[PDB]
Structure 1
Amino acid sequence: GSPGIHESKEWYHASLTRAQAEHMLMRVPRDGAFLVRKRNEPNSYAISFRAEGKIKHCRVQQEGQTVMLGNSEFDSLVDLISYYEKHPLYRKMKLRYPINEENSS
């Protein structure tokens, strides 16, 4: 809510090892979780998430006008996943796993 508009800090990564996220996503069997991280430049972001145990991230693009997460443009980084949070991202993912299998039952 308050913490998310423009400035954000809780799911996006931009300091710790980005590749280390894959080793942390494989330790969670049965569904993984949805996260994000920075790339090798301030002109492109990515989403690190996974299910089962086949870790896979994503690459969101951005232009000088609006951003393009995929089939929708949403210059807002939080609004981009805000509407897609309830809708389906890839052919099945849905950012519905904001935590690792441990106490979400």
Structure 2
Amino acid sequence: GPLGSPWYYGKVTRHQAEMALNERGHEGDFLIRDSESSPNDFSVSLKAQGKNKHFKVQLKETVYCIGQRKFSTMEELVEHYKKAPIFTSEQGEKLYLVKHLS
């Protein structure tokens, strides 16, 4: 729900997010949506080859929590994963966030 928060795409479901990413997205494009299975939290949905990825972001007492990392704002979370991988395979393929889907 946040107004005045350009990081927030919308309250699209997982399947609706997959459709938008496949229809208009390029590798590295992503969107941030409410989580369907944990409604007070968020999901980062990433356009990736083969199968798109979805990552959990918990909002706990103002702090944005992803994996073992903590960020004061969603914007800083996004900036971190533009330069550090958000996903690494066991064979070394790394994925980064590039830009928000419009």
TM-score by length of 2: 0.68
Larger CA Rg, structure 1 vs 2 = 1
- Which stretches in structure 1 are left out of the alignment for 5+ residues? 1-5, 100-105
- Please say if residues 33 and 97 of structure 1, whose CA atoms lie closer than 8 Å, have aligned partners that are also in contact: yes
Match of 2:18 among 19, 22, 35: 22
Report the residue type matching 1:35 in the other structure. L
Question: Which of the two has greater strand per residue?
Answer: 2
1:61, distance to aligned residue in structure 2 (A): 1.2
* Matched length: 93
Match of 1:95 among 70, 94, 97: 97
1:79, distance to aligned residue in structure 2 (A): 0.9
- Which stretches in structure 2 are left out of the alignment for 5+ residues? 89-93
1:31, distance to aligned residue in structure 2 (A): 2.6
Q: Distance in 2 between matches of 1:60 and 1:85?
A: 16
Question: Which of the two has greater helix per residue?
Answer: 2
- Please say if residues 28 and 53 of structure 1, whose CA atoms lie closer than 8 Å, have aligned partners that are also in contact: no
Match of 1:51 in 2: 48
